[PDB]
């Protein structure tokens, strides 16, 4: 997260880290056994780390639980990035508490201008590389589909939205993928892609979760 702020320990209790010997993506806890992330975060052998703040230290509220299933959307297109969503089943159910909690799925799509919270352990520099110890947060608005298409001609599908600031300086970045965009207590987005990080005229692009709610519920239930 570039241009954000330190969340505070366990203030985003649905945020998880996906670990393959190191942190490589985020995700969002949606019930005690299931996490939502990005399809491009697929790896075999994922360990989900819940209750994290400092990801480089064991602080006392962590739960480390291996993935038992990592299910990419059956129509994910690795060229166009359409349908960039994945569901991870936990091998055992997480213990839910004040520091480990699920986030609700949306009941309807969010509109342009709606303010959201984006979080992750990704790079904090727009030029260069600095990875944080603790979780970072950013407040950013959903942008219009028209503005998103203007920023990225030919690239934005009905399952994507832009969020952020056209002047630059505030965005998601490498290591934030798969993590949450939460608006009014609902998971509306998944960190997906962009053009650089926090560059002028190049807002971040996010998977539009409201389009997948029926698929998420049915897939969870049939696995």
């Amino acid at each position: 997260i570039v241009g954000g702020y330190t969340c505070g320990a366990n203030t985003v209790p649905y945020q998880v880290s996906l670990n393959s010997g190191y942190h490589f993506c985020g995700g969002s806890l949606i019930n005690s056994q299931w996490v939502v992330s990005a399809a491009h975060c697929y790896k075999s052998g994922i360990q989900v780390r819940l209750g994290e703040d400092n990801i480089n230290v064991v602080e006392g509220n962590e739960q480390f639980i291996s993935a038992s299933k990592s299910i990419v959307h059956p129509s994910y297109n690795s060229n166009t990035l359409n349908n960039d969503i994945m569901l991870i089943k936990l091998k055992s159910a997480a213990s839910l508490n004040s520091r480990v909690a699920s986030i609700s799925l949306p009941t309807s799509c969010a509109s342009a201008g709606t303010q959201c919270l984006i979080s992750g352990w990704g790079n904090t520099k727009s030029s260069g590389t600095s990875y944080p110890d603790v979780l970072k947060c950013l407040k950013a608005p959903i942008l219009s589909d028209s503005s998103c298409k203007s920023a990225y001609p030919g690239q934005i599908t009905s399952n994507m939205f832009c969020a952020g600031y056209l002047e630059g300086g505030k965005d998601s970045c490498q290591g934030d993928s798969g993590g949450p965009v939460v608006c009014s207590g609902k998971l509306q987005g998944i960190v997906s892609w962009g053009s650089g990080c926090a560059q002028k005229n190049k807002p971040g692009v996010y998977t539009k979760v409201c389009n997948y709610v029926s698929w998420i519920k049915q897939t969870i239930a049939s696995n």
Binding site: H40, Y131, S177, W193
Partner: protein, 57 residues
């Protein structure tokens, strides 16, 4: 054009996945951050794979 001589490509996705690329200036396979999509060919999951494909380019 030898794909082993191309600079490493992070791409547009926002993962932080460690991959290998052949660094012809240094003469060795090195790590870099791959964003998770649209990989170019100078991008390997292990140093062994990179050395096998590109070593001595």
């Amino acid at each position: 054009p030898d794909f082993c001589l191309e600079p490493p490509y992070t791409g547009p996705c926002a993962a932080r996945i460690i991959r290998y690329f052949y660094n012809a200036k240094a003469g060795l396979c090195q790590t870099f951050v791959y964003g998770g999509c649209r990989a170019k060919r100078n991008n390997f999951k292990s140093a062994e794979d990179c050395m096998r494909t590109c070593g001595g380019a």
